Design a protein around this ligand. Structure first.
Ligand code: HEM
Ligand code: HEM
Ligand SMILES: N=C(NCCC[C@@H](NC(=O)[C@H](N)CCCCN)C(N)=O)NN(O)O
Ligand SMILES: N=C(NCCC[C@@H](NC(=O)[C@H](N)CCCCN)C(N)=O)NN(O)O
Ligand SMILES: C[C@H](O)[C@H](O)[C@H]1CNc2nc(N)[nH]c(=O)c2N1
Ligand SMILES: C[C@H](O)[C@H](O)[C@H]1CNc2nc(N)[nH]c(=O)c2N1
Ligand SMILES: C[As](C)(=O)[O-]
Ligand SMILES: C[As](C)(=O)[O-]
Ligand SMILES: [Zn+2]
Lengths: 404, 406
């Protein structure tokens, strides 16, 4: 029942016992494994049970399980759900749950920081305009002049028979994707749909490759509202290469703050449909995926032709050589600009530590191998040689339907 | 919509549904509770063998388009008779050829399956001694190597018999470099082969002291201790490694063999188990340049090469491991090309595996694949497989790891 988890670079071995705590099901069955798939294909009792577990998790955290404070807080929850069908979290319990959801994110390689998370309580939000203020503050705090600080702002929980508070953008800061005449796309191809919704909603579009998009914020059962972000609020890094003087002339650049905003935060059965978070970028996200995915800026061939590689045959490894300089350009530029960034070697080594801290702490750590291993130089990182067990622990961050 | 796993490619946005998984009859290591997809090692009564056999025979007649015919019903009759009075049974020539190819085709961890139909099957179920085994292997190596223009092949030795001992090739590959345990604790040669090297010596092998000494073979006929056989040097083709523009790389003295001949996997067909059945095709560029040469627990030449390239190896952020690994891989590719030895880089290899997925989609409605093994150890998202969701499941015939004989 309990999985033997071996590391093939050091021969070490551990046994994940934490997985027993998983209450929800994944996509795999003995018949077949769907671990590489990206996406997955309330009764007072159901909710009440999730709540109980959460509160028990909280009091155990403050090392006061079974105490008076515990017993009474459990009754409050019972009382509220029994009469209203739902309940609410106390700011401290929320702070704990947020850190925990991050702690349980199988796809996050930066979890060595899970304990250092600034939680903003925005549950007293009744309008989109109010959401925008909270967001504008999350950004100022989070960015901190280039010295990034992990943070999350939490908006009103979902409610039976009432629309969701949502941030239509998958990230607080993103570059527009402008479909053009010849099926072409100027900018970030992954953001075409949202850039179009922004237009149909009255935004006056630009024509740059890196035009920061406006936010479509939506308060319950109301049409989304467009809000433009103060340019000086959006810290960005121009990319230049340490030795290739011609790199800078490509005009490439990327924003400093990675703030996911399309995910749902679930804590004790309660669902928070709008709870943007942000820590800091790992260089490959920008250097490998964002700039080199064939369905993103797809700049691989350009940079290679620049370097003067033989982009005529796969055997010259021009793709591999270009990819590395671009990642080097990112790491160099963020350091030059004094903005928090972490390379993939540094990051994965730290994640290796996290795995160890968690083994002693909880008896395991849920991890999605395909996501933890970097998009380049996989086996050159420790995590590649590390076996992992993936499963669902709550508090958790889940994906949710786009509100349109 | 469709009631089977929905499979998506996130680069092109295309979708398919895997219906082939429905044919699997062996449970994997995952459960709805947790995914053990990243684990390397996932932890007969006539009745069981009979049905396994029936399934295989059906698969074969199915492949030739005579499913349900008289010849089909007779063969099934035959296998049942034989199993009825002997406990086991034998495969016909063409049945073994079919099964060996399906086993390769069904292998979830092989990125080179586009070549599955083009495998030369050498039948050796008549082999009776360890010496004959050596001869069989020498022919395989000779034909398979074909002077640098490699040809996929597999030599199948006698299936396991009830009670009777197994035929086994102790070495994990027909060609492997010795791993010498040092005084200072380090290992000279390939760290991976430390034990088989220690076993070769315990059996009378006179060791060398280099980093690229070819191990001798420890072959084992039923119920006998393994005999030691040394491969004649002329039969083992090697490629001295050199970089195309870094002139000093050639001075590093790195080299690798051309024939990747896995030799300790069990080939299971219709319930029958072939404990010895060496197969070989050709290397994928990154197998040597990234894993064998740069793994921390293998040759680990990463720092050396970086120092030669004068890279700042004091900080992770200089991407010195990344720059070096690229060059080492390019050297592997450059040296095999120059020496006219067959090899395929991670890019072409993965483009061809995409084409294979497409072929298999149309042919069987699915292709079992191990994402972690399909996606290369370097430049993952630069290859198309990375963006391809894959379903993993066990189909038979198939290759399986098996316990080391000793
Ligand atoms: C402080 C530095 C942090 C680093 C270096 C880091 C890095 C990463 C990386 C590499 C990924 C995968 C990104 C991708 O491929 O799209 C990831 C995923 C994730 N991270 Fe972290 N993380 C950090 C902070 C955070 C914070 C503060 C939270 C939450 C409070 C968080 C929640 C998650 C979640 C939920 C995922 C999955 C995203 C998805 O499915 O699209 N991370 N992280
Ligand atoms: C035509 C050239 C071929 C190429 C380029 C190819 C490539 C590969 C690669 C890259 C791997 C993973 C290596 C590793 O990570 O250790 C692999 C694994 C495998 N291949 Fe292929 N292959 C080829 C031919 C063959 C042949 C002829 C067979 C068998 C009849 C085959 C059966 C397998 C099996 C069973 C595995 C998994 C082995 C294991 O679990 O260690 N391959 N192949
Ligand atoms: N440094 C990070 N990185 C996490 C980045 C997550 C990224 N996900 C993606 O781009 C997914 N492919 C979107 C999948 C949504 C489909 N439901 C996104 N939403 O921008 N985090 N910090 O907080 O620091
Ligand atoms: N190009 C290839 N490559 C196949 C390489 C497979 C490799 N596996 C390994 O080294 C596993 N880690 C060993 C698993 C043992 C588990 N007991 C091995 N045995 O040498 N094939 N052909 O071209 O045929
Ligand atoms: C299909 C495959 O699961 C998909 O491309 C995954 C692979 N690994 C990943 N790893 C990270 N960090 N981020 C991703 O988006 C992905 N995408
Ligand atoms: C722990 C993890 O499963 C292990 O390092 C796997 C990852 N992917 C691999 N992929 C291939 N082709 N070969 C390997 O040996 C591995 N090792
Ligand atoms: C340097 As540019 C082409
Ligand atoms: C150049 As070499 C040491
Ligand atoms: Zn799985």
């Amino acid at each position: 029942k309990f999985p033997r988890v071996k590391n093939w670079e050091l021969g070490s071995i551990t046994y994940d016992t934490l997985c027993a705590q998983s209450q929800q099901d994944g996509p795999c069955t003995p018949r077949r494994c769907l671990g590489s798939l990206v996406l997955p294909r309330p009764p007072a009792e159901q909710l009440l049970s999730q709540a109980r577990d959460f509160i028990n998790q909280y009091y155990s955290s403050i090392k006061r399980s079974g105490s008076q404070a515990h017993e009474e807080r459990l009754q409050e929850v019972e009382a509220e759900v029994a009469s209203t069908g739902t309940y609410h979290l106390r700011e401290s319990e929320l702070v704990f749950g947020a850190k925990q959801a991050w702690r349980n994110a199988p796809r996050c390689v930066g979890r060595i920081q899970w304990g250092k998370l600034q939680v903003f309580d925005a549950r007293d939000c009744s309008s989109a305009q109010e959401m925008f203020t909270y967001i504008c503050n999350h950004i100022k705090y989070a960015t901190n002049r280039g010295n990034l600080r992990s943070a999350i702002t939490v908006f009103p929980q979902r409610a039976p028979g009432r629309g969701d508070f949502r941030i239509w953008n998958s990230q607080l800061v993103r570059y527009a994707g402008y479909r053009q005449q010849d099926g072409s796309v100027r900018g970030d191809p992954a953001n075409v749909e949202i850039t179009e919704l922004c237009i149909q909603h009255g935004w006056t579009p630009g024509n740059g490759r890196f035009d920061v998009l406006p936010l479509l914020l939506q308060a319950p059962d109301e049409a989304p509202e467009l809000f433009v972000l103060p340019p000086e609020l959006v810290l960005e890094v121009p990319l230049e290469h340490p030795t290739l003087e011609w790199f800078a002339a490509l005009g490439l650049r990327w924003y400093a703050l990675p703030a996911v905003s399309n995910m749902l935060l679930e804590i004790g059965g309660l669902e928070f449909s709008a709870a943007p978070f942000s820590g800091w970028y790992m260089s490959t996200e920008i250097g490998t995926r964002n700039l080199c995915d064939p369905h993103r800026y797809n700049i691989l061939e350009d940079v290679a032709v620049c370097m003067d590689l033989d982009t005529r045959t796969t055997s010259s490894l021009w793709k591999d050589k270009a990819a590395v300089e671009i990642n080097l350009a990112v790491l160099h530029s963020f350091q030059l600009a004094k903005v928090t960034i972490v390379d993939h070697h540094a990051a994965t080594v730290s994640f290796m530590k996290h795995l160890d801290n968690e083994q002693k702490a909880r008896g395991g750590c849920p991890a999605d191998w395909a996501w933890i291993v970097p998009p380049i130089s996989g086996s050159l990182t420790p995590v590649f040689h590390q076996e992992m067990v993936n499963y669902i622990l709550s508090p958790a961050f889940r994906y949710q339907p786009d509100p349109w």
